Amino acid sequence: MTVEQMMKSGEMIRSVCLGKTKVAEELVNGLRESKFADVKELKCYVNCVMEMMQTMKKGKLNYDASVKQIDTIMPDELAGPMRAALDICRTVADGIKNNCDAAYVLLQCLSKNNPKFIFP
Fold this sequence. Notes:
Layout (H helix, E strand, L loop, with lengths): L2 H19 L3 H7 L8 H13 L3 E2 L2 E2 L1 H11 L2 H13 L10 H14 L8
Helix pairs in contact: 1-3, 3-6, 4-5, 5-6
């Protein structure tokens, strides 16, 4: 995928998701700094992004789509550590019934376990 198209989609996804949840941008930017504030609309922003990316459905991790996406967006140097994160975190959100909470728990884990973590 082209940097052009990849940036475009990540922007698209951010646009859609900021639109649906009306979260403050600073909060969303906070995420890339591991500031995981317990804010309902920030949690649902995260869930929105994961649903858009096909990585989560009905608050459940669907694994192969995530690896595809990791490997497509990231170069090898980064995907290595990130697929690892997804493996370490594969069952971390099981039994979380609320979709937004489940997504947020997964993001926390991915960020804790991946030094090259990026998020739309």
